[PDB]
Amino acid sequence: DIVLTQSPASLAVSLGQRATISCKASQSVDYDGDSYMNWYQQKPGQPPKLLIYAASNLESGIPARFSGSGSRTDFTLNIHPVEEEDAATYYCQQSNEDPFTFGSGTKLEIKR
Amino acid sequence: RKSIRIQRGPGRAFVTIG
Amino acid sequence: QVQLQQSGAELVKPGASVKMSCKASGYTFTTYPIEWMKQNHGKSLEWIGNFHPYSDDTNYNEKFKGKAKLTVEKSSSTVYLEFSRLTSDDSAVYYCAIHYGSAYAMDYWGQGTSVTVSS
Secondary structure, rough: OOEEEEEEOOOEEEEOOEEEEEEEEEEEEEEEEEEEEEEHHHHHHHEEEEEEEEHHHHHEEEOOOOEOEEEEEEEEEOOOOOOOHHEEEEEEEEEEOOOOOOOOEEEEEEEE | OOOOOOOOOOOOEEEEOO | OEEEEEOOEEEEOOOOEEEEEEEOOOOOOOOOOOEEEEOOOOOOEEEEEEEEEEOOEEEOOOOOOOOEEEEEEEOOEEEEEEEEEEHHHHHHEEEEEEEEOOOHHHHHHHHEEEEEEEE
């Protein structure tokens, strides 16, 4: 099992400013040159969208503004252009070792 | 040729059986 | 096209056993293993386990191992989630998402399902 102790669960970021959702893991969730760390964007009353997979491999569907910088346990969600669409809770689920678990979550509240 | 996505980690990779 | 039309909006009573059903239209099923996520209230997701229709293999959570019996229905491409002895503290939003696109996380999640406890 791995504990996904994320950074400040709740924070405010204005439109344009970058957000930093760093998900720290207690154990190494990396594999043979491929980290297994996923990030979801569970919007208010909407299933968690698969934003990033395999640590930093963008999921074919979302814009090229959801970057992911992380190695071993120190992971982060680099969202430079934080638009209104970033009004959801982000979770980090490790799929390297059993049992698979999610992170504390990060309710990102955008600011006009 | 057959391939299935397994439920065993790491992740759900694909294995070509038969 | 593909879609996971799950149904599980029931008012379960302490000590009951509701059998959910996550249908998979436009699905291969045997090739696409399904995983369930339990979101107790407005909290983080909790991976309760997974299932494989090809080999009929499951991987339940050490805490919910045995309590949740995943029945196989390849005929209708639907996986049943029989939750037994549901305690009052089991009110959560289940989601039968799979790794349709990438082999790391789930892309196609369920159409929203929540079980409320009367007491």
